[model samples]
Target: VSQEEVKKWAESLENLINHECGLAAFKAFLKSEYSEENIDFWISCEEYKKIKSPSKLSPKAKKIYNEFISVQATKEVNLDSCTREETSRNMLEPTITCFDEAQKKIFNLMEKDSYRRFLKSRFYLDLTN
Candidate 1:
C-alpha cells in the first residue's frame, strides 16, 4: 500500500476499512486492545448485507446473532439494551437491514473510540511510513 493510501485512512473509518491493508492494520490494533469483537461484528454484518440468496440469509443472520449478539456469546460485541432487543426482534424476519441499527451502533463506537486511538498508534503510523 502507498503512503498516500495509508494517510487517507485518517479521513474516516470507512476509508480505513475499504482498503485491505488498512483493515488488517486496524484489526490488529483492536486485537491488541481486546476489542476486536466490535470490528468483527461490523464486518460480519457488512458481509451479511450482501447475501443475495433468501435461503442463506436466515442462517447467516442467526449465526451472527449467536456469535456476537446473544448473551455471553463467545465474542459478543457490546450493545445497548434497546439495540439488542431490536436485533432480537428483527431475527424473526431476517432482512438485509436486520442488523443495520446494531451495526451502526458498533461502527459509531469504533469510529469515536478505537479508530481514533489507532490513528495515533504505531500500528497505523508505521503503515504510513
Candidate 2:
C-alpha cells in the first residue's frame, strides 16, 4: 500500500474494529488466511496499553508476549527475529511501545492483504445495500 493508502487504513482501523459488518467480514477473511491471531494479538495489545496501573503492566505484557509473540507461542504471528527480540527486551519494562513495530506490520498486512478483500466480500458489500 502507498503511504496515503496506509494512512487511510490506519485511520479506519479503529472504525473497522468497531463496525459490526466490517469486523465480521474482515475477521472471516483473516480466518480464511489463517492470520486471525494477528488481529487478536493486535486487539489485545491495544487493550493492554490502556491500563493505567504500572503494577498490571508486567503481567499483562508477559501474557500478551507469551500468547502471541514467543516463537513457541500457540498463536504466534509472523514477526521477524529482530522485532521479536526487541519486543522481548521491551516487555521486560513493558511500555506500550513494546508491540509497536509488530503491530504496524500486522496493520499493513490487514490493510494491504485482507482488508481489501474484506471490503469486496459479500458480507461487507451486502451491508452497504
Candidate 3:
C-alpha cells in the first residue's frame, strides 16, 4: 500500500480506535450518531479499503484497536512477541505509548515546509531514510 493510503487509514482508524470498540460495535457506533453518508465516509478512496486494508489488518481489527488504546495510557499492550523483561511478561502501556509517539512524529514531518518535496529526492531524495 502507498504511504498516503496508510496515513489516510491511520486517520480514520484513529476515530474508531478512540472509541475502543471492534467492528460490530464500530459499525453500530457509526449508525448511532452520524448519518450513513458521513460516518462511513472514506478519508481517501475505496481503493485504500478495497485493496490495502484487508492485507494490512491483523487477524482482527481489535488488535489494532487495542494497540491504539494503549496510546491513551489506559489499557496496556500485551506481549504478542517475546520479551526480555522479567517484571513484565507482556508489552506495557508505556512501550506502546512510545511507539504511538514515534508515529505521530513521523506524521508531523509531513507538516514541514519542504517535507513532501524532499520525499522524492534520491540519496538526497530518500524520505524513508
Candidate 4:
C-alpha cells in the first residue's frame, strides 16, 4: 500500500513498526537515509520466529547472522559485539529464538531513532493533518 494509505498506522511509533503497511512506509523512509537494514533485520527476526522445523531454523538463523551480524557484511545491522557473540553461540544450537536478543536491539534502535523522526517526516505529515 502507498504511504498515504498507511498513515493510520504511521501515527504512532508502536503502530508504525507493528504492521506491514506501516513498516513498508517506514522502511522506505529509512531507505532514504540508507538505514533500511534496521527494519529489514527486525522484520527478518519476526518471520524467523514462525519456523517450526529444526532443519529450517538453523539455516535461516545462520543466514541472518551472516547477513546482518558478520563484520562488514553487506546489509549489516549495527549490533554490539557481545550480542553478536551470543548469537553465534546460539546458532550452534539453532532454535527459533536464536536472534531474539539481536532483534530486540535493532527493534529498539529503530523505535527510538527512526520512529520518532518518522512522526515528523513529510511522508507521515502529509498523510495526516
* TM-scores vs. true structure, each candidate: 0.82, 0.74, 0.20, 0.76
Which model scores highest in TM-score?
A: 1
Error of 4 at 127 (Å): 2.5
User: How high is the lDDT of residue 107 in model 3?
Assistant: 33
Q: Which stretches in model 3 have alpha-carbon errors above 4 Å?
A: 1-21, 48-129
Summarize candidate 3's per-residue lDDT along 1-129 as a digit string, tens digits.
234433343345443223433233334433443322222222211222343334333332334334332345243332222221321222332222323332343234222312232233231123134
Model 1: how far residue 10 lies from native, Å: 1.9
lDDT, residue 77, candidate 2? 87
**Lowest lDDT 10-mer window, candidate 3?**
39-48
Candidate 2 Cα lDDT to native: 0.70
Residue lDDT tens for model 4, 39-113 = 777788878877767689778778888788888687777777688888889767877667778777776777777
lDDT of 2 by residue, 1-129 (tens): 223433343367755666554567567778888988887887887887687565687787777777777688877787667888877887667676667777887777777766677666665555433
Q: Which residue ranges in model 4 land beyond 4 Å of their true spot?
A: 1-14
Please count the clashing residue pairs in each candidate, in the order shown: 0, 0, 2, 0
How well is each residue in 1-129 modelled by candidate 1, as lDDT tens digits?
Answer: 788876677777788878888788778877787888887787788788788665687887777777787887877787777888777776677777788888788778778877778777786666655
| Pairs of colliding residues, candidate 3 | 121-125, 122-125
Candidate 2, RMSD to the unseen true structure: 5.4
TM-score, structure 4 vs. true = 0.76
Distance (Å) between predicted and true CA of 78, model 2? Answer: 2.0
